Write a protein that binds this ligand. Sequence first.
Ligand code: F6C
Ligand code: CLA
Ligand code: CLA
Ligand SMILES: CC1=C(/C=C/C(C)=C/C=C/C(C)=C/C=C/C=C(C)/C=C/C=C(C)/C=C/C2=C(C)CCCC2(C)C)C(C)(C)CCC1
Ligand SMILES: CC1=C(/C=C/C(C)=C/C=C/C(C)=C\C=C/C=C(C)/C=C/C=C(C)/C=C/C2=C(C)CCCC2(C)C)C(C)(C)CCC1
Ligand SMILES: CC1=C(C/C=C(\C)CCC[C@H](C)CCC[C@H](C)CCCC(C)C)C(=O)c2ccccc2C1=O
Ligand SMILES: [Ca+2]
Lengths: 135, 44, 751, 163, 80, 42, 147, 43
Amino acid sequence: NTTLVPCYKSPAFVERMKNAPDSYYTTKPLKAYSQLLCGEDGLPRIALDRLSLAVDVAIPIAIFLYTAGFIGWSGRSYLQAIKKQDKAEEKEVFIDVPLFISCMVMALFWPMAVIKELLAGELVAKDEEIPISVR
Amino acid sequence: XXXXXXXXXXXXXXXXXXXXXXXXXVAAMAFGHVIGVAIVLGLT
Amino acid sequence: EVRVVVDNDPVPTSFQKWSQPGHFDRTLAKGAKTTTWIWNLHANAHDFDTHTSDLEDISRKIFAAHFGHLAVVFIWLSGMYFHGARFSNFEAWMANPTGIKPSAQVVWPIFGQEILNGDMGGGFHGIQITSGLFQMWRAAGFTNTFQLYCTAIGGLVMAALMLFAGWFHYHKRAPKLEWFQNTQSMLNHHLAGLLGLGSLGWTGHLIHVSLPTNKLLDTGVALKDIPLPHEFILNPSLMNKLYPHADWGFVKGVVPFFTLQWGHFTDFLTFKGGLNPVTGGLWLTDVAHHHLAIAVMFIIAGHMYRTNWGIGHSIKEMLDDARTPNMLPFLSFIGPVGHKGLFEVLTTSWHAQLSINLAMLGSLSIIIAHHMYAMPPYPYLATDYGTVVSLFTHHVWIGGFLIVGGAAHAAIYMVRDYDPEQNFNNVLDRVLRHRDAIISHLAWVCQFLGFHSFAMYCHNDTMRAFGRPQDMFSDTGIQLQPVFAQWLQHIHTMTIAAPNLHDPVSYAFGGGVVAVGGKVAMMPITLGTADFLIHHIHAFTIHVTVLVLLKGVLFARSSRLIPDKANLGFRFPCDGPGRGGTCQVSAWDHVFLGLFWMYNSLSMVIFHFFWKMQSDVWGTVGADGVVTHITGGNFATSSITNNGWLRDFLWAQSTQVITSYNTSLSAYGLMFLGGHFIFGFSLMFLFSGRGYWQELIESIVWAHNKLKVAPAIQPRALSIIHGRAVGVAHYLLGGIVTTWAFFLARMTAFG
Amino acid sequence: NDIIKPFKGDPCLGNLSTPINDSPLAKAFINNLPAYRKGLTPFMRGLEIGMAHGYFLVGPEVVIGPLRESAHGANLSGLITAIYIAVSACLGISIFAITTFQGNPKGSYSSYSKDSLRPLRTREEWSQLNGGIFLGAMGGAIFAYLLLENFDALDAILRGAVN
Amino acid sequence: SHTVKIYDTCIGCTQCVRACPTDVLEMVPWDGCRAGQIASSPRTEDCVGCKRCETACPTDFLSIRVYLGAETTRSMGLAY
Amino acid sequence: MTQLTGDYAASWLPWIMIPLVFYILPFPVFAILFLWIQKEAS
Amino acid sequence: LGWVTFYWHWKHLSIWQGNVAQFNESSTYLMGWFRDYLWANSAQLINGYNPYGTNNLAVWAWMFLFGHLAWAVSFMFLITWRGYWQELIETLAWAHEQTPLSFGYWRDKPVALSIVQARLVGLTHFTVGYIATYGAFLIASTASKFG
Amino acid sequence: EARYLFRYLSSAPVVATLALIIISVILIVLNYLFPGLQYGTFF
Ligand code: F6C
Ligand code: CLA
Ligand code: CLA
Ligand SMILES: CC1=C(/C=C/C(C)=C/C=C/C(C)=C/C=C/C=C(C)/C=C/C=C(C)/C=C/C2=C(C)CCCC2(C)C)C(C)(C)CCC1
Ligand SMILES: CC1=C(/C=C/C(C)=C/C=C/C(C)=C\C=C/C=C(C)/C=C/C=C(C)/C=C/C2=C(C)CCCC2(C)C)C(C)(C)CCC1
Ligand SMILES: CC1=C(C/C=C(\C)CCC[C@H](C)CCC[C@H](C)CCCC(C)C)C(=O)c2ccccc2C1=O
Ligand SMILES: [Ca+2]
């Protein structure tokens, strides 16, 4: 797309700078919006061009997907940590915070943990392990 | 004050409101003020 | 014989049971097999009548829990005075209480929400509060923020006493049942020691703090020349230029009370009965006289019942003597038994008491709302139009929730505490024994009013659309005049028997217009056809709310469908799909439906209020005397079609909350959308059932079993009753936040 | 002792003997209304019920109807309302009689029903009722129409204006 | 006129009969249980359809089914 | 204008059929259609 | 389809009135959908009849309010369920039997309508109120700005 | 006694409520990283 131009060269967005108070919020952030692909209305936008933004449409996605899996992995690995203890019925209502923290430090390097979960055939339960309905 | 003297209202209470129900274990001298003050303020 | 009897250290004080939640129920205290256990732990936390069985131990929980509740109110009261102390423009608002807007609760600069700190006048940036705290602290005599702060301190230490008193009365000295069951002694102390001494204490404050302080504040002394409230008593000569007809000395100034020469008090205990025209509130001298009259009349009331000195009344056989050898002949139909066995109802069961005490605290809260607009007691209250609406609206809603809760426990009493043997042929049993004639005639009057209130709005909506405004129920078409209410408006203004009240109480009734800061404090509120029709909407919606709630009380025990509805409990979803379907037959499900009807009824009451003030009462006065109302007589002509309600009230008056972005009213715009989300979100729980949702969890539990991440707290969809409770809790939450946002954005955009 | 008894002495019946349904005055009034008067053919039951209703049904349309503004046209709009309400009402009780009396009426019109509040249980009795209700509600409507269209002529003769 | 069928998975726990508000169910002798009993439904025109019998059956995916069918004057519970 | 008229041909025909199919015929129709749904199967 | 047709209508209502920059600058947040589409374009719909007259939108203003009632009455069949109404009809059936001069009697016993039927009766009102309200909005908000 | 208390403090909701209180980096991190932080801005 070529309708989007940087807020450097955008008549509708310098007008945003002109009538801007400061107070904390419309100078320090608004200078940083000058590097964004900026529409014909003076509004920063998220476009998907090519390698020009191929790293910037990967910083949020890598930061989220890592820490979403980090929450998911620590939460998952804490569940099997207490199923094997045979105490998982009340181990869940009363969080064992030393065990849960030790399951979080296992989840820092979770992307390489899931691979050896998968390559060991251990991440995913086999189909006739799973309670199902009549079907 | 001088006159007023609403001790007649209490005397008309102690000799009348001592025929209540229990009448044992004096509120007529409490009631005689309620009647007494109301009347003297009700005729001034 | 009234006595103090207590136990000694009945319940130990340890955290043994904190670590094992659900201990109060044996079913809960065996493990969390499913997530239903989590919700049952909260829906049962306060039902003390199912934790234990003996009334002695139940009543000790009630009494100790009240103390922890009073602690919570004192924490909240402390927060109000603390915010009025160091986060408010209360100092500025005392100097000029017309152009300065009341505001506590400033907003932190983060997330761009500093925009909510709007300009309040005087260079203070905050949020315009509509709680009326400032108008109440001025009437209490507060002048500086140190007095507010030390009252906040005085409330935190007062909350600590409530917490200690609750622990002390459950874990150290818990009273026995004999101490609780002498309700006849409790009435003596609550009537005399609490309400009598409380209003005697307050009229002590009014005369010695509020009356002098508000005397000088009306002459414009600007918070320098205001003496501190104690300097009025340490310097008794200071209150002789004010109220000179008294004497004002320690002993020399009080003896007119004892020698009954009360004429010296006529200058500060007046009976003017109107609105103080410089502030718009009631005369504080007239208020101080009121509390003294109330105090004397409540202390007297507290000597009615018989404690251990023989003299007094016995409620027990005042009730038992309301049989029918001795009644008026026209109401002699209530049984040879009459009221026997009914003193044991209101003594051996707390739900019987809670049902009455809620239905009267709810009705009191609505009465209070009607009285604090028609005769504002606080200085500069009536002119703060955002506070008048938000105080009426708050107390109508609070009063309507409490009324529904009085009908809840009237039904929990029936299916838990109702005893057939003590209630044979008495006044309660004879109601259940004809409960089809009560509901038939309630369901008919609900339906008579439904056509004759709402369907006349659809008559008007159709003649005005046809272009026949001369055959619509207008003031110009077929007039429906409130004949019996315009008569009372005439009675209440010609009586100024009651001759001493030379100033008409409640300018609403008639006579005069009060304009304080140019804005009208109070005007006569005339009644026309639009007020006939809106008052029968009120009658209609109140009746159906009564019909829903009374049906749940009378048919709580049994019906013709389910003769054993009492064994199923108070809170059960249904009795299966038989008999065609018995969904929502419980008494709980009539509280759940009465909550919707309370919402319908009260949201029509506050809409009747909000539009009738903007069109007929509120407004501004120019330099001639004419009043330009906020909407300008809009109610009389356009509130008679419920298209007029949608365009001249809902569409027109929402301009302030719709166009509120990028302004200080921005948060009311978000709440107004937030309330719309929650209402629509509620309908997920109301329109659907948990068979769909449980069968959806199974497909989602499978996706977790596949990745070996299933929980052992098995996910269950919410109960049928739980899902109905969630639906009504969100419908009422969302539908009120949208009304709260709409009222306050409209009236903080004006004044 | 108590004034509210079980209904005719049977405690199991779903009613009460109350001053409204079982009073000497209230029984005397209701049981002599034409619906319940002993000794009436069903025609005279309906004829007297009909005329009471056709008479008052012309009222609510001649003074708050759409034609109330004029005088001669108001009375037409009130009469035809009573014509239409009664014709549709008498259509209702012809089709009520057809559909309830079909061999063993399910309900209060069974042979072994012993119900006093509705004594017309035959279909020989509901057909004269229909004729009475109709011809009554028509004559009552006309009589209230003739008295209203001649109101100026009738106001004079109850004021002595005709000498 | 509902249809309360009983299946061979009963254990003679007797709980289904107690829950029935209209006495449709009763126990007959049997041999497929330690209890030697099984539920039967001789009075199903009296079945109101409440399924209160199904709530009491403890066998997983319960042995007694109410099959809501042709609803008549006594299977809908009408006092009028 | 202040009346219902018709420029279209046979303008007298809505004058009678709007009363017919809407408030004169339906009550006979709802009576016939009532006699059909409540007849004994003897 | 109350999102598809709302989006179709507002996008075209901005092109048709020439104010294309109204949809582009205010459809990205939900208040713009609520202030610039529903509140803005209702103005001539609800003024189809006012105290001062009546115009060609008086029927659309009436069906718009008709569909609000048909929608609201759906909530009755969807929120309150069957057994509430059977205990209330059982009471009205008592009243009819015990009252004088009421000579009619039901050929078939009045019962509260069934569970799966109210879900259908309430779904019909929700649908009719969804279609009459938006049909009246869409017709009147488009045929009033324009020809 | 201070053994049952510390188990209560880590039970179910107090861990969850504290977690949401501890998840208040979105208040500190977005207070001094020039609060406006949109996707193309932060590195
Ligand atoms: C015949 C038959 C019959 C009779 C007689 O016989 C009757 C009667 C009664 C009495 C007694 C009473 C009172 C009355 C009054 O007030 O008001 C009016 C109303 C009406 C409705 C009125 C009506 C009357 C008649 C019906 C008339 C006729 C009409 C025409 C004939 C039609 C036409 C025909 C053609 C074909 C269409 C009543 C009532 C009630 N309902 Mg009752 N009905 C009946 C029917 C029906 C049906 C179908 C239904 C469904 C819709 C119902 C419903 C109801 C309800 C909700 C209620 C109520 O609320 C009420 C009560 O409960 O109380 C308390 N219900 N209800
Ligand atoms: C706007 C939607 C709506 C409407 C019209 C109604 C209407 C009604 N409700 Mg309901 N309710 C609603 C929403 C609604 N409710 C919702 C959303 C809930 C959820 C909580 C409930 C819950 C509820 C309960 C629990 C109860 C009711 C009851 C009632 C009835 C009250 C009796 C009455 O008013 O007589 C008047 C009738 C009306 C006002 C309906 C409109 C009448 C129009 C204007 C006249 C029609 C003209 C003509 C007849 C048209 C026919 C022409 C022909 C061609 C068909 C009534 C029919 C109560 C009841 O049953 O009373 C005994 C009852 O207990 N409602
Ligand atoms: C289905 C197509 C259809 C529809 C929706 C209408 C609709 C209408 N017509 Mg009709 N009409 C039609 C076909 C239709 N017409 C045909 C083919 C003829 C030629 C004979 C006529 C001749 C006609 C006349 C003379 C008049 C109308 C009039 C009217 C209006 C008032 C209602 C009425 O009295 O009509 C009366 C009905 C008829 C005269 C017969 C039409 C019936 C058609 C032939 C079949 C309809 C049955 C349908 C297919 C089955 C569905 C039933 C059910 C499943 C819903 C109304 C807008 C009146 C008017 O002008 O309003 C101002 C008027 O007086 N129409
Ligand atoms: C309950 C009661 C009451 C009420 C009553 C009422 C309700 C009323 C009424 C009334 C009425 C409502 C009456 C009426 C009437 C009528 C009549 C009297 C009629 C008639 C008629 C005629 C005579 C007709 C004739 C004809 C024919 C038939 C045909 C041809 C034509 C002509 C016209 C000739 C009271 C309270 C008071 C008291 C007592 C009891
Ligand atoms: C990049 C890009 C894109 C695209 C994307 C795509 C298109 C994709 C895809 C993809 C795919 C195709 C996927 C997937 C999947 C499959 C599967 C099969 C899975 C899974 C998973 C799992 C297995 C998980 C696991 C886990 C974890 C990881 C952690 C937590 C725990 C759990 C277990 C959850 C976009 C445009 C957006 C943006 C820009 C660029
Ligand atoms: C949606 C819905 C459900 C499902 C409702 C559910 C599942 C409730 C959802 C609440 C969620 C599950 C809250 C859980 C919070 C977790 C503990 C996550 C917290 C973890 C962080 C704090 C770390 C019903 O069960 C239901 C029943 C009857 C009528 C209508 C409905 C209905 O509409
Ligand atoms: Ca007219």
